[PDB]
C-alpha cells in the first residue's frame, strides 16, 4: 500500500497585505510589551481588507498552477479544503472555481472537512485519486478569514488569530522522480469533540428553534482535557505511523511541518529537534485556521528551501479530535 | 480506470416516527386539497422531535452495519456526507463517530461536502480508497434536518422540506461477485453559485462584519437560470458518463436512482421512462436535502427489490451548481 507515488508538483500563498504588528495591538489594548511573544509566540499577523475567503484562495491556487508549470485550464479536480466556511451554500469548492474563471470549465469543485485538518486530508483522498488515474492535477486550496471572529475584549483571543491561504497543486510524478507518500494516518477520538467545538452554526442550535444559548457562536474550549487525549493516544498513533515505513525514521526527515494554532505544538517540537528542522509560520502568521498547515509547507519549500528527493513530516492535531501525521519524500 | 470493483455491502435508514400529512398541513394552513401533491409531489413527510442529526446518523449507520454482515468496531473509516451542518465546529464526522458509541475507537471520521451531492462524492472516494486498499469497510452517513429552516407563512418552502438520514457500508466484492462502478463522474458550473446560494453562514457575512443584509439566512434561488445551465451543459455530460462504459446503457440498469429535491427531476425521468425503472421517495419524504439520494438508494434495494447483478444509475444536480452520474452493477 506504500509507498504512494506523489508529487506536491505546486505550491501558492496569499496573505493580506497589512501587516499587524502584536508591539501594535500590546500598545493599542493595554498589554505588556512582549506579551504576545512570550505567551502566543506571535510578533505579526495579517488581516484581510475587504477579501473574502474564494478569493484568497484563488489568488494562492493561480500561483500554485504557475508553480506546478501549468495553466488554469490543466486542472482536473479542485478540492476546497479550509478549517471555516465562507457561506452556508455552496460550498467553498464551486466559489473557488467561479473566482479562478474556470466557472463555466466544468472540472468538479468539492470540499473535504476535517476541520483545521482538511489540507491534510485532502492531500490524502487526492493521492488516492491521482494513484487510481481518476484525475491528473489536483488543486488543493485552504483559505481561511478569522479576523472576523475577534473579539477585542479579550487578549487570548484577538492576539491569536490571523488571515491567510495557501494551496497546493498535486500529480503523479515524472519518470525517475522520487516524489512519495512513505506514510500516512488519520485517527479520531471523538469523545474530545465537546473539548473543542462550537455549538452554533447547524442545525443542532439553529436560531430559529428552541435549543440556543448565548454562548452558541463561541469556540468552548477544554485544554486540560484536550491534552489527556494526547497522552493517552498520541504515543500508539506515532507508533503505528512510523511503523508504516519501517526504513525511513525522523532523522532520515529535514522538516517537520506542523499544524500550529498555538506555540505549544512548536515548543513541544522545540525541545525534541533542533529549531532548523522545524518549520514555523505563527510568529509572523498567527493562527490561520485551516490555512496553517499548508502555510508550513509553503514555508518549507520557498523559505526553507526543501529539495526534491528530502523528505518531510506533517503532523497535525485538530478539533474532533483528530491526529494526522505524513511521512513523505518531496 | 472503470469498471472499478465496488460493493454497497449495506444500506439503512432513520427517519422520524410522526406523519405529516400533506392534508393536515393543506387543513391547518389554508391551502387548497391536494395542493401539496400536485404542485410538490409530496403527500407525506417526517418531521423530528428532538432527534440530533448525528443521532439520525448513527441510527441509520447501524441498520447499514448490521446489514453488511458486520460490527461497529469493523468499520476503518467514517465519511459523514450530509447536505447541511450539525454545527460549526467540529465536522460531522466526529460527532456521528461519538454517536455511535465508537468515541474512543481512533477509526478516522471526516467529511466530504458537495452540498445536496455529497453522498454521490462521498462514494467517489470511498470507492478509490477501497481499490488502493487504504481501508477496507467504509460507512458514508447522511444525515439531514431541514424542519429547522421551515417558514410557515410560505407554503413553498413549509410543504417541500422533510428530515431524514441514510447511510451505506462500502467494501471491496467478494470473490465472484460482480459488483462495480461503471462509470462515475462529477462536473461542476460554479457560474451557477449564485443561482442557488446562502451567503450567510460563514466568513463572508460573518453577523460581527459589515457585510450582513436582512437576507442572509435564505436560500437566494433562481429557477429559470439554474435550467439554462441544465439545457446548456446537461447533454455533453450525459454523453461522456455514458461513453464510459460503452457497451452498458440505459436499457440495461433496472432503476435510475436521482436526488430528487422537488417534483421537476421526477416528471422529466417519468417522461423519458416507465414508471417502475424511476426510484421515487420525495413522495412520502419530501425534500430532505443531502439524504434524497441514499434514501431513494435504499429504496431500491429494500423496497424496489434490486438483486445483486442487476445495475442502477445515480444521477442529481445540486447547488454549486453540480451534476453527478453513476452507473453501477449491485
Given at each position: 500500500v506504500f509507498p504512494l507515488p506523489f508529487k506536491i508538483a505546486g505550491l501558492g500563498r496569499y496573505v493580506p497585505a497589512d501587516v499587524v504588528l502584536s508591539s501594535d495591538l500590546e500598545k493599542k489594548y493595554d498589554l505588556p510589551p512582549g506579551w504576545c511573544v512570550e505567551?502566543?509566540?506571535?510578533?505579526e499577523r495579517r488581516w484581510v481588507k475587504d477579501e473574502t475567503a474564494s478569493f484568497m484562495g484563488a489568488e494562492a491556487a493561480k500561483e500554485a498552477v504557475r508553480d506546478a508549470g501549468?495553466?488554469?485550464?490543466?486542472?482536473?479536480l479542485i478540492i476546497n479544503a479550509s478549517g471555516?466556511?465562507?457561506?452556508?451554500?455552496?460550498?467553498?469548492g464551486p466559489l473557488v472555481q467561479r473566482e479562478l474563471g474556470?466557472?463555466?470549465?466544468?472540472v468538479p469543485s468539492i470540499t473535504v472537512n476535517a476541520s483545521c485538518l482538511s489540507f491534510f486530508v485532502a492531500l490524502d483522498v487526492a493521492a488516492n485519486y491521482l494513484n487510481m488515474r481518476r484525475y491528473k492535477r489536483i488543486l488543493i486550496v485552504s483559505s481561511d478569514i478569522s479576523?472576523?471572529?475577534?473579539?477585542?475584549?479579550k487578549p487570548e483571543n484577538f492576539t491569536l488569530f490571523g488571515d491567510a491561504a495557501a494551496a497546493a497543486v498535486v500529480t503523479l510524478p515524472e519518470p525517475?522522480?522520487?516524489?512519495?507518500?512513505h506514510a500516512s494516518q488519520v485517527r479520531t477520538?471523538?469523545?474530545?469533540?465537546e473539548f473543542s467545538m462550537?455549538?452554533?452554526?447547524?442545525?443542532?442550535?439553529?436560531?430559529?428553534?428552541?435549543?440556543?444559548?448565548?454562548?452558541?457562536?463561541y469556540l468552548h474550549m477544554n485544554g486540560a482535557e484536550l491534552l489527556k487525549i494526547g497522552f493517552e493516544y498520541l504515543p500508539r498513533f506515532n507508533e503505528a505511523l512510523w511503523k508504516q515505513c519501517?526504513?525511513?525514521?525522523?532523522?532520515?526527515?529535514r522538516y517537520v511541518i506542523p499544524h500550529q494554532p498555538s506555540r505549544v505544538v512548536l515548543d513541544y517540537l522545540s525541545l525534541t529537534y533542533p529549531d532548523d528542522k522545524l518549520v514555523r509560520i505563527i510568529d509572523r502568521f498567527?493562527?490561520?485556521?485551516?490555512a496553517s498547515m499548508p502555510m508550513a509547507l509553503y514555508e518549507a519549500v520557498?523559505?526553507?528551501?526543501?529539495?526534491?528527493?528530502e523528505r518531510g513530516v506533517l503532523t497535525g492535531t485538530g478539533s474532533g479530535v483528530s491526529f494526522v501525521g505524513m511521512v513523505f519524500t518531496y
Open positions: 505567551k502566543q509566540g506571535i510578533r501549468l495553466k488554469l485550464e490543466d486542472i482536473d471555516s466556511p465562507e457561506q452556508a451554500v455552496p460550498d467553498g474556470l466557472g463555466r470549465s466544468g479576523s472576523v471572529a475577534l473579539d477585542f475584549r525517475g522522480e522520487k516524489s512519495c507518500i477520538y471523538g469523545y474530545g469533540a462550537v455549538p452554533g452554526g447547524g442545525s443542532r442550535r439553529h436560531p430559529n428553534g428552541k435549543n440556543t444559548t448565548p454562548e452558541d457562536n519501517p526504513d525511513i525514521t525522523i532523522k532520515d526527515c498567527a493562527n490561520c485556521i485551516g520557498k523559505v526553507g528551501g526543501l529539495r526534491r528527493g
